[model samples]
Structures are given as C-alpha cells and as structure tokens.
Target chain A: ANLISFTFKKFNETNLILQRDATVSSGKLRITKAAENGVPTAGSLGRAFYSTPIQIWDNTTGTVASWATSFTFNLQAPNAASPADGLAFALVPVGSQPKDKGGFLGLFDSKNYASSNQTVAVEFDTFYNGGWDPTERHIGIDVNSIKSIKTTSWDFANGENAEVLITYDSSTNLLVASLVHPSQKTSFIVSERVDLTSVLPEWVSVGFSATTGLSKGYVETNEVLSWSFASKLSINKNKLAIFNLEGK
Target chain B: ANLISFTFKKFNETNLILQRDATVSSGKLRITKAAENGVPTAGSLGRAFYSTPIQIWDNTTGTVASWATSFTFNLQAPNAASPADGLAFALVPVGSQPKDKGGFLGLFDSKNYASSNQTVAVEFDTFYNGGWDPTERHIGIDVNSIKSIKTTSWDFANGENAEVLITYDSSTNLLVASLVHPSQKTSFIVSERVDLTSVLPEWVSVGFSATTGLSKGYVETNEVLSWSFASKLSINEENKLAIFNLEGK
Candidate 1:
C-alpha cells in the first residue's frame, strides 16, 4: 500500500504540513524563509507530508513495505557571498518539529528533541557547520544527531535546479540515494543498508525540512520545483534504463 | 535604504519573511498549523515584511506620517464545531520574535516581553484566556503585554471572510482600527492616541503574529487572502467615498 504520497507544484495542494515558515510560491515550495525583514532570529522552516502520523511498519503484523521518492531542489542564496544552511528530507516522529533552529535541519536541538525524538534524514548540505558537515555543497545522511553517517562532497550551483532520487528495498535492506542535474546526465549514487523497522515506528512522519543561518541569519531560500514519493517501490525506467538493461 | 515595502496579496509576493510557522498556499497566507503531522504542540507563526526592517519615524525631526491599511482574514476550524485560537497584526521591534508560544498571540509572553519588547496589535481572537484575553470572539488592542488596552466582543462565522482596516493620523495623534464582515458592512471602529514616536524606535518591524491554544490546543486555520501595508501612510477611497462626501463636517 502507498502510505504517503505527493506531487506538489502549486500552493493549494494541501496534502503537506508547513511549520516554522515553509511556504508554497509560484508553483515552488520554499522550505526556508523568503526575505521577510529578519523576523526569524534562529528559525527553521519545514513541511511534513502528513499532519497526522503515517503508518510505516507494523510490528504486530510483521509487515513492512519498500518506498521510493524523487524531487528537484534549488538551494538559492540571496547574495554572492551570503552562506545559507542546507535542507533535509527526513523521517521524524509523528508530531515532531525542529528542536532548535538553524542547521539542525528542523530535526534536532530541542530540549526534548535529542532525548525525545527519533529521526533519519538525507541532507542536501550547503554550508559546512564544522562538526556536522564535512564541507559545503555536500550530501550526507543524518541519524539521531546532526552528525552524518554517510557523507560525500556535492558540487552544486547556488540557484540551479538539481534532482535527487532515493529508494529503500525491504528485502535487501539496501538504501540508495542519487543526484542528477541538467548539466550532468549521469546520476551520483550513494548506498547504505538501513532497516526502517529498526529506526522508525509503525506510525511516522515524512517530509522536507531546511534551515538558513549566516549573514544576518539569512536562509538560503530552499525551493522544491516538483516531487513525488510513495510506499510503493516502483522503478523509474528512463533514469534507470541502464540498470534494467543489465538485468535483461 | 529600506526598499522592499509592500501591501501584500497572498503570501508569495516575496515581500514578507515567515517566522515560526507562517506560510503561503493556494493564494492564501496561513499563520498556523500546516500539513506535517502537527509538529507544533504549542505553536506560533509570524510574517515580517521588509526583511531589512522598516523606517517608522524620526524623533529628532518629529516627523510621523498618516497611514492606512486593510486586509482580509479567514479564521477557520477543522470542523464547524471545532475551536480556534487567534491572530494579530502588529508593529514590533525590528527583528523581534515571539516572546512565548501558543496563545500568547505570538506577540508577547516571554522573558521581558511583558516589560521589554515594544509592540502594538489589533487581535482578532477566538478562544479567551484568563490573564491575556478577557473574553472570546472579540477584537482587541494589545500593547507591550498580552493584556488589551481596548476590548470588544465580536461574533463572526468560521471560514468566512472578514475585512479589517487600520489607520493613523499624525496630526490628530489618532490611531483607528475598523472591522467588517458579510454580516455587517459597517466598520466597527476603535481609536487611541498613541504617539508611535514615543512607543517605537526610528525603524521597526511590521507584520502578522498569531498563536494557538484551546479546545485541545487546536488553533484554527488562520488565513489572509490578501494584505498590504507600508510605513508611508495612505488611504483607500472606495470604503471612504461616502465618508469623504459627507465630511463637509
């Protein structure tokens, strides 16, 4: 069964929840602040797909399903030199929000966040916050803490659109994340083995979260042009034609 | 120079900044709980326009201009019987944030908020709190604290559009706020002589701040279909056309 799903392009597609300032504009979903006169001193913006909890797995029934998601991102800076915080696609506890603002990725740093919440994330990091991020413009996987488990350098433009595809196979427990851009026809792949049943509850929340911290506390204006996700593990033919051909 | 002044329509015109949990969607600006599993237990949302702060008035020069602003509001419930918290349009310190969360009106209720931050607001409230809000379903004026300087009872429908207009006259030292809805086209007016020059700094932040709490911590879906405001005071002739014609008083 397809648990959580989305294909957002307009502001009215009211399937997702917005918190700490994320907004939909001109068919774009901005998960961070727009230039609003510095009101959010150390704030973060987030949108979770389900305002109520979503069923991820059931221990009593011993049922778990695979999932796949793809979305386009444009992490844009206001000026040439202003540094912006990165964005995260996360799995957080139902009714969970960012503990503290800024690069906590709207997933950590609250009084009860680290001690109370459970989450896993794939970060499209833009700025290197020293301990957590190894470098600016990189991709990393985040666990209970802001610290990453799998980190890699990601070379990306400040404003151009970039695509990312992520999938998890329940049978193999293999999770793969890939990135693609207009200039690069190839996809950058990163793989790891994770069991959602181990890290998440049967009822969980799924969504995008981003933060901006630097240069007068400016956020990078993280925007989503389009996106799709579901509990069904379906293959993307054209983007993965080479893999299908290998199987043939 | 602070150049990004605006009278907003919808949220994404890009003139305002969102704080806490404010967002724009479907041509409406929502100031409370969004779609994600309701992460905010006690939540607050704010939108401050002019990311660079706004120039209000000068003390040395003693120059304060007259101004007028009007916006539409839609406070909605999940169901017809569901309850709602409240929303506020305020003028606050440049970069000022919520002093506390949930039912503080997202304007005050934190460290020094009752004594420190300088703010003024017109609250369209639903749920009544004991210390802050004296009664429910009323329109009131908030000063430095959550307590209202002026209060009045207002009965309105959920999800229906209501219009509010506020204005300040420098010469008369008068500030007036008006509310209108489908039930009544006549504006309900409240006035006070607040020398903003005495209450605010030279440059301040102007925007919307709202809070949630009541009937199980449920904040109604607060929506602004269209809004616009600026430091430069101006007037709308459409609503005042008849008034101006009779102002031979």
Candidate 2:
C-alpha cells in the first residue's frame, strides 16, 4: 500500500548547488542534504543564503534573467544559543554572478538590489535577530528586505517537526507559504498568501543559492542538506511531492 | 391496601391461650404481652400441630366437640442467660388437667409423657438438661416418649430473632422443620414423620405452657413474632380447613 520513488545523483562541488532546472512545477519537491565535510561557511555563496542578489536564469533566452517578485529563506539553527546565519528563497533581477561569501545576500548590507522592484524573497531564516528571534530560531516570510511579514517559532520541546510548503496559485495570482510542524498535534503552523504576480515575470529562472561571510558566519563542512525542485513541465510532477506538500 | 388488627385482653390463670386466630387471610400479625403479676404463656393454636388440638370444648367421654388438625405458637422468652424454663406444643388426649411443669411440659423431659398415646411434640426449647441445652435449643418431634424421631438446632447467632417453620405431610405422615435467620438464609434442621393416628388418640388438646425453676428462665419477653397452621383429617384427605382461635387466661 506504500509507494516510494527517488533518484540520487553524485556531484563533486564544495559549495551550494542547484541540482535541477529552474522551471516551476505543479507538485511538491523536498530537498534534504546533510553536511558531508566540515561545517560550510554559515552564509557563503557556496553555502546558503537568500535569493535577492542571487540571479534568475531566463528559460527561453538561456541567459541570466531577473524578476520583479522576490523570495526569502529561513534556515533552522543547529543549536539554541547564537544561531548560524540562514538563507532565503527569492526572485530577483540580479544575474547568476554569485555575491561575496556572505553579505546577508546584500540584504544585510543593503546593497544587493539597487532598485526597489528588483526582488521579492521568502526567508526561512535561522538567525536570532533581536526583532524576531524570541526562541533564537524561527521561520518567517520576508519581503524585499529582512522584514518578516508572518513568522512562527517551532516548538521542538513541545513536539514539533519542521517542513515548509509553498504554493503559487496561478488563477488567484497569489503566492501562499506555509510552515508545518508534523510532530505537533496540529498540521499547519503558518499559512499566509501574498500577491506575487505583480513582481515576477512571465518566464523566469527559479532556483536556490547561498554564500558565507565573516559577519554572517560560514557554513561548516557537511552542513548543507539536499535540495530539489518540481516544475510544471515535469511529467512526474505529482509523483515528486513531499510530506508537507501532500498535506497542503 | 395495608390492614391493621389489634386486640387487648387480661388473663388470670389459664393453661392454653391463643393471641390471634389463623384464617385464610393475607396480612401480618404482631402479638405482645406482659405479666402484670404471674407469667402468661401465650402462642398460636392452629391446624398444623395436630388434627384435634382445637375444639370448642373437651367432652369427658374422650371426644372433642370441634377438633383442629394442627397448631403453631409464637412465644417470647424472658431475656436471661437461662430463662425460667421453655414452652412446647403437645398433642394429648382431650383434658383440662395441666401437664407437669419444669422441663416436662417444656417437651425436653420425655419421661413425663409415659402414659399419653401417640403424642407428637415440637418444642422451641431453650433450657438445657442432659438432653437439650444452649448448644441444643432446637425444634424436635417426639413420638410417645419411646422415640426421638427428629431434631434440629437453629444455626443463627444465639442472641437474635430466630424463625422456625414446621410442616406436617399427612399423606406420608412426615414432619419437616426448618430454621430461618433474619438474614433470610435458612437451614433444614429436622425432618421426620410418625403415625400420629397410632400414637395420638382420636381427640387431642394442643396449647403452649411454660415454667420457672430456681433459674427463673421465661420465654424472652416480646419474642413471639408470628405463626400459622393447616391440617387434614386423614393422611390422604384433600379438602382441609383452617380455624381461627384466640389465647386468653
């Protein structure tokens, strides 16, 4: 009664890598990878960071592309005290030229995007910035900057498991993001929708990238987990769905 | 539909007294009495004790004017370790002379009824002699003093309300006695039968009698609870009748 399907590919890179194409898909995709070497730089470009300075690839032109919509990332801290800098999921006009090892994806230094309409990012940040880190680690939806639109701290001691689900409703032109703790008695933790059609182009490259720096901290070796994506063009898009995606 | 019946009477000197009459009735009877001076021994005289214990009058010609087939008695003993004595229901020849006192009329001393014919006596005896005592206060059926046919002791706690039911099957000439505790548990104490027709004369007198000796044991005062009786003429007689009578001094 149980069905399982998976594919594994080996790579020889020392930085954050996007294994699949940047096209959008209907079903869900889950990326889970564990650090194989030393902890990578906390926010290194070859590590993990947000998407503002990270460029988008053009699907038709096959060149570096940009978009109006942005995405953010919120990484869970490995420990409780001072946290490791996390990354973001974004759609920005910046090309694929990686930024510094970690400059908070230029959002922290406020230099990644020169124009305001250049980026929109959803951030699963693990850092405990005084404004949002009540439990030192939390999941939030960040717009252009590190401003959290909606946020929730996982209750690990109270039995919580983290899994994020993001959906883009083409008909409603709404981008919905939800955080789930499967171990909790409830199924969904944070569920909110944002209008992203005004920011994103019709055809844009979509992928995840990261960087590390002295300020944002470096990701230790073997610290990066796996990464995956499911686009609308994939025939097995429905089969590629993960746990949180099936729940949504 | 509950009913209440009451009666008050004074007694001087009498050998037999019936407090309440037994009829085809559906109600309960509670009898109580006290000795203003001398003790008064009262019980039920019904149709279960003998075939001729109840009669309008005793005829000197050795015949009863009206004879009852059986009778029962509800008696109280004076509350003491050893009451003055005990009481008994005896089937004897129709007569007016009082039976011997002490344990003789108490039904424990069978030697006194040497000359009586076919006598069957069941005594709720209390006082103990060589034969019956505290350990053996029981319901016993004796036939003509020559034989102790059947006997049974009440198994309930000594100082409490004890009930005993005795039935006589005329067809088989069998007498059965059972003692019941207030807890509703019962034990078959005695069961035996004798040809009363062979040992008892055609006409008989049945009643209750008590005596007090140096020990001064009387039926525990106010212990007589309730009783009734039924009987037949012949062992095979189908149609039988119940008689209503009263006990008086």
Candidate 3:
C-alpha cells in the first residue's frame, strides 16, 4: 500500500549520506535546503545534504504529472527556552544553497536568498514568526516564496519523529500533506493547490533543514526510516520498467 | 507479497531498492540505480523487483516450492593481476555475448561461450582460458555448443562467499533458484532436468553481471543475499523445461 514504507534501523553516519553542503555539520538530513554553508551566514550553522542529486524529472521518468512522498520530522524542545526554530522537508532546485540563516529557516535568506531560495518545502514550525502564523508550532507548506499557501497546527511534544506524507495531483494542481501520529493514533491533513510544474525544474536536491535561534533552545536530530518516490515512465521506455509483474 | 520482500534490509547507500519503475526521483521507492566503486558491472545496475517474476504457482514461506537459499560471488584481483576477470548469473537467450573477455566464464565472450549462450545458469566461474579457464576455479551448466553439457568444479576462496541453491523437477522442468542459504536445515527436491522453456525469445538478458578489466588487491566482491526464481505457471500447451508435478490427480 506504500510506495516505500521502510523502517530505519538507525541513521548512523555511514547510512545517513549528505552532500557535504550546509553550515550545521551537526545537522542531519532527516535538514538542509538546496544549500552549502558556502558563505556561512550568522545563525545558519546547522546544515545537511543528499548523497547524490535526485532526478526530480528527466522528460523521461515519471510522466505521471503527479507524485507523493512521506517521511518523518521531529522538532524537540531542549528543556530550556529558545528551542530550535523548526525544520523544512523540501524539493530544493538544483543550484540553490542555505544562505537564509536565523529566522529564515535556511529556506529563505535575508535578501530573498538572491533567488537561490528556489525550492518548495513543508515546514514544521515550532517557533512562530510574524503575524503569518497562528501558533508557535505549525506545519506550513512553502513554495518559492516562504509564504505558505496552506498550513495546520502541530503542537506535538519534542523528540519523536512525526510520520508525514505529501502528494501532488497535476490534474487539480493540488498538493496535500497527511501527517499521522503512530503512537497517539491520531492524524491531520492539509492541502495547498499549486502547480509545481510551473515553478520548478525536473531535477533537484531533497532533504530537511532546521535552525536554532528561537526561545525554545536547541533542536536535536532528524532521520528517515525509509522513503520511496513513484511515477509512470516517460518516453518509450517501458520494458526497462521495474514492474514486469503482469508481463504475459 | 511485497516489492523486494522486506528483506531489502539495508546495505548502506550502495544497495538500492526495486519496485515498479515509474515516476521520477521527485516520486518514490528507495531511489537511485546501483553505481560503481561502492559497486561494479556491462553488467546491468538496475532492477526488476518482485519474486512473482518467477511464475505460475507462487511459492513462499508456505508453499509447495516453499524455499530458502543464499549465494555469494566475489571479485578480487589484489590491486595486482588484471582487474579480476568477471562473473555473471544469467538467464540469456539461445545465441549471445559471442566475443570479448576470456575468463568471462560465459558472460561476455563469443567464439564458443556459444550462441546466445541460451541457458539458466547457477553459473559461477571466473577467467581460466579456452573459455580462458586455467588455474581458475569455476562452475556452470549450459548447452552453448562449447560445453554442451559440461560441469566444472568451483575452486574459489572466501574473503568471498558462496551458499547457492537451485531446485528443478528432474523430468518436470520447474527450475527454482531461491537465492537463499542452506545452513538453516530445509530440503526439497526438483527433478532437475529441462531447458528454460521451448518458447523464450532468443535475444535475452535475465539477472546481473559485473566486469572490470583491472583491479587493486582483494577489492572484488559478489553475493546474492536473497533470490526466488521458480513458479509452476505455464498451462497446457506444455512446457519443455518443466513436467507437471500433480501427476494426474
């Protein structure tokens, strides 16, 4: 029933691959936007990267016009005040980086990330910034602009990974996020109607990005137990497919 | 019942997962194709997930062909020799890889590795000569004209591993090679005789291969952690490779 529903034995250094980009060496993928700590801005220390660049599109794979991804994100409060700001799961455009430090959450830097802020993300906001939010903790879906088109409250405690799933429907141009709580046996859903095909390229880098400049303290680690991306094949490449299940 | 059947476990970033080929990386299923250094291979590096590709009556932890198996193939040329020759586990057509690489076992080389090398091999043999098999240790079963029904001994060492098994009906060709291990006591017999089927296209490729002409010390490795390729699914027109097991019940 799941494209890739796997259980991570652990996200040890060997298995948790990174692009070697980003400021927070302490940061795990399970954070980082399409970035490297190239300039190492003030508070954008924690960073992460993917082992390899992902082929978001190739005019070849996944001609399905639609897609879905599910993973976990946890923002733990460090017992003290000023907890880490929060993290964002993103599809960062290929040539971007983590210039947006501090309140920027690495998704967007102070001066518009000079357009390097060209990525889409779903943020788990543990620290409220400006009047754009309703609570200290929430899930905000972000595209090129940090302004989230859709969101929902996520007032869960610190430390446990939140099971999250996102989907894209090209037909309706609707993007949906389904966040579920395994132990608590509860869940929440949020949707944003956007056409990703219009704002991004086909290949990109993906990972999580978290910052620590709020009043709740330091935000710890992140990990992905397992993940999968599914789509229809493009061009005339069908035999090379992974599903020969129905071949007569 | 599953894509790769849990069992995919994890082998760091080098190992990849298999599922229906669809979408893009923006999509899902553990992503990426297998690459070299961290891996090797003319030799294909992608996959066709699912044990169901086996056929007919499905076997599982609880079926007639209920099975278990394990295989380990190693590559090692000691940063010295000539990159350790090559190795392959294939189900190729009647006429194939006719030329190139000597110790190719039966993978790449023409002349007499024979036509399409038409076969289903538990084949594990590295460079020697003739087939280029000299002081070389090996094993293979095929009808490629050169060794029309020849069997060789496997004289390789570990630092490399090997625990391979195949099950086939002697008179009934329900060939099965569940890439599982035998250390865990469980035995079932296959009549073990018959070709891959009278009706398979002669131009073919089934399974994996890897070959690097040169190497640095003990750096070659081969292993099949798990595999399931056997099913009783061809009805009535009759299968030359497999005999009916039910025997007129």
Candidate 4:
C-alpha cells in the first residue's frame, strides 16, 4: 500500500523541504527567491523537495514501481530578455544536497558527473553549456550525467504558464515527458529507456531545482504554480499469486 | 462511471468483433488469417475491434477523457523474410469498416486520406511506401491521414515478442507511445499532440488492424498476445464546484 498522491492548487509549505533560497510566496513555490527589489541575483541555486522519501523500488526484491506527475511552472526574467540557466524535475538519493549552479541546474557539478552519483533529472534548459548541451532551449533527459540521453526542442515564453506531464513505466523502463504551452499553442514530448533500479536508491527525494549564472545583469526565475503526483508499486509475486488463488 | 478495463492473457472472442479475416487461434488474436496450409496470402487485410464503443468525450459537454493502454504483439513473416505493410492500433467511428489492404494497414486507402475520415492510429510499420513513408521499419503516429506526423525507428525480429504502451492526456491533447522488445533489447518512443475531440466522433470503436501487400512471395503475419486498456473522464466541473462549496471552502 505504499503510495504518493497529492495536489497543490496553491503552494502551502506544510510538507516541503526548501533549501538554499527556495520559498513559498503568493501561493507559488519559487525555486529561488528574488533579490532585494524583486531582481534575481546571479550565481545562485535553489531546491525544494517533498519532505517524505518516496519508495521508487523495493531494495530487497528489486521491483520497480510506476509513477506519474504533472506540474505548471513559469521560467522567465524580470526584463523582457532572458539569460543563463533553467529548471529541472529531479530525483536524487536522500540526504543529497544541491551540487552547483548555472548549467548544472543545482543537481550536479563538473566533478560529480559520474555513475557513482545516483541521480535522474529532466531539465527544461534555457542556456546552452558548450561542454554538454545540444542547444540553449530544449528539454533534456539526464541519467547519471549532465549530458542528456535524449532531447527535444522547447520554447519558453516569459510569464506564460507552461505545463509538463511526466510518466514512467516500470514494465518497459521507459520515461516520457510531455510539455504543453496552451497560450502559445506549442507542445513536444521526449522519452528515454532508463532502468531506475540501476541508477537510483530504493528511497529517493523527488523535487525541483533551478539556478542562475554568474553573468551580470542576466537572471531567470523559476516558479511552480501547481503540482500533482501519483505512484504505485505492484504486489509481490508470491503475494499476488496467493491473492489470485483466493479470488478464484 | 465510464470505464474500459480488461486483460487478454489469452484471446477469447466473447467481447470482440472479429471483422474482415480476423480470428482467434491458439490463444492469440490473429489479425489476418493464414491462407491454405498455414501460408499467408497477399492483397488481404484484417481488423478486430472491441465490441463496445467507448466514449472519447462527452457529446454535449465536449470534455475529452484521458486513456492508457498496453499491448504485446508480434509481427513477422515465414521463410525468414518479410513483405509490405504493417499493423496499427486504430480508433474510428462505430459504423466504419475496414477500408483497404496492403500499405494501408486496413485503416485507410489512398483515396480516403482526408480530414473527413475521422480516424486516429498508431502504426508499427514494416514496409515503406514511396509516396508517404520515411522508413520501412518505424513506428508512426497518424491522425485522419495516412501520412504520419512523427516517426521513430523500430526493428521487428522474426517471431520476437514486442510490447507497446500508449497513453493520451486530455488536458494537453498529447499522445505518447513507447515500444520495447526485451529479447532484441531495442526500444524507442514517438508522440504527437492531437485533439481527439476534433478528429473523432464522441463514440469511437478501438481496436487493431493489419495487412499484407500484393507483391508475390512476400508475406507478413501480425498477432496480438495480450492487451489492457483504461480510460476516465473527469467529473463535471459544475458538479465538482457544488461539492467543493458544500465542503465550506
């Protein structure tokens, strides 16, 4: 009966773990708060995770579960033009902290892009890092490394609400993400086949992270307007067999 | 209370409409029957639809519903070689019939590729048509036209079981499909943003179809092993708001 299901029509920080400038303001979860005069400061990162660690798989039996989530967010700058960095939906091991800012999106750093780090992320990137990014504006699927396993083109409109639906199937080990901008009338989907049992711990923190670069006069704010998630694990094989016999 | 849910661990025809050469043989849904002596004939098509037509959207309210399905299938040929055409999971009006064979996959022919046809399909294609195909081995997403909007490469192994998961979100009108072949260790996904309310009737039949070509000495057999589907439409917004008001919020 392990399940995770909740909806935030508006942000209420009751079950949130805000870290390094993350906050709830005006009913929205601001991944990184604004500076003194509502201006975003460069060279910063923020993260907000659900307080409870969700069980992604059974460590003892190695059975993975299926999960789906949808969220609405806005990524924009105070001025008409935008600059470096973006936001991400991330899954990391418990007790993990923010790694770095800028193109890393607060999940990984230059030194930590290794298989030893158990992290999975989907980045809605607005800035391109010559080292690893394919383009400045794209949705990337990241496994253990910052380099994406797959990508699709995306356009971000300042102050416009965009929605993302991400779903994972345990049977096929496939992860699919669909992004839609109703006002802009644009949508795209990206998917990858990843085995979470090999890339993540049994208990993981699912959350959102964002960052801004060190370049002066360039900033971006990532705001989560609403969110919902649901997950379920199948019954154990022996237990399922017994239940089937009883039903018969 | 509108829901569609069932599992075909093995094919049983109790709730199926076997149309145009479709049959159940040896616990599998054979989309096209074999000719004499277990051999496939060319220029033939087959279709198998679920008996009940499901409501894709409320006719009066125009609110679309979300649906998800997973099915295991195999497409192969005899004599270690394959031929034209492929298979598809299709949604069409209740009274629609199989249109044509060969590269059409039993859904549409060359003349019927019009917006008025009101059909949506996901094709696991094996042969390429010079007129409108990107590759011979690919998965394509089609909406009312034989021409696919998006495609991803796929390799069909002879007699190898493959699985597909297709999910549609009403809120975004997006359809995503993921395919996997465990034995061959290959997988890919293709998706498209389609508005079912505009492209389909309120009540639509959902099912599978396949076809073979007219070229001699080239044949393909498509079989479905198992399938499961579930769909749900949200409660009326007016009713939901009334319930929320009663809760004092």
Instruction: Please give the fraction of native interface contacts (Cα pairs under 8 Å between A and B) kept by each candidate.
Output: 0.00, 0.00, 0.00, 0.01
Put down candidate 4 lDDT per residue, A143-245, tens digits, no spaces. Answer: 8777888898787787788867666667667777767675655666677788998899888888899988888777878889876665666557211111111
**For candidate 4, lDDT tens digit of each residue in B1-249?**
354555566778878988888888878898876866777777768899888888988977668866766678987777555566788999888989888778888777563358777899999888878778885478888878787878877777777888776666676576777676766455566666788988888888988989888876668778899776656665561011111111110
Give one digit per residue, the lDDT tens place, for model 3 in A1-248: 11211122234345333432332234334442222422211133344544445543456444434444545555444352445466677777666656565566777744232444567788777666774565556777776666576677665665665656555544345555655444443345566666655666776665666665633234443334434333322343210012111110
Candidate 3: tens digits of C-alpha lDDT, residues B96-134: 342333244334334354444445544455544453343
Q: For each candidate in the order shown, give its overall lDDT on alpha carbons.
A: 0.60, 0.37, 0.41, 0.74
List residue ranges in candidate 3 displaced over 4 A: A1-9, A12-44, A57-65, A110-116, A214-233, A236-248, B1-249
Q: TM-score of each candidate? A: 0.44, 0.33, 0.41, 0.79
A1-248 per-residue lDDT for model 1 (tens digits): 34334444344447667786778766777777665562332345566454546665666666665665666787666563556677878777877756556767667763222524567778887777776567466777666777776776677676777766555546445565656554332234455666777677677777788877845746466777766555532222111111111110
Chain B fold agreement for model 1, TM-score: 0.80
* TM-score, cand. 1 vs. native: 0.44
Assign candidate 3 its CAPRI class.
Answer: incorrect
Q: Rank the candidates by lDDT, best first.
A: 4, 1, 3, 2
**lDDT, candidate 2, residue A89?**
56
How far out, in Å, is residue A206 in model 4?
A: 1.6
Pick out the ten consecutive residues of candidate 1 chain A with the lowest summed lDDT.
A239-248
Give candidate 2 regions above 4 Å deviation. A1-248, B1-80, B106-118, B131-135, B156-162, B183-186, B216-219, B234-249
Q: Under CAPRI classification, how is model 2 graded?
A: incorrect
Docking quality (DockQ) for each candidate: 0.01, 0.00, 0.01, 0.14
Model 3 chain A — which ten-residue stretch has the worst lDDT?
A239-248
Cα DockQ of the candidate 3 complex: 0.01
Highest-TM-score candidate: 4
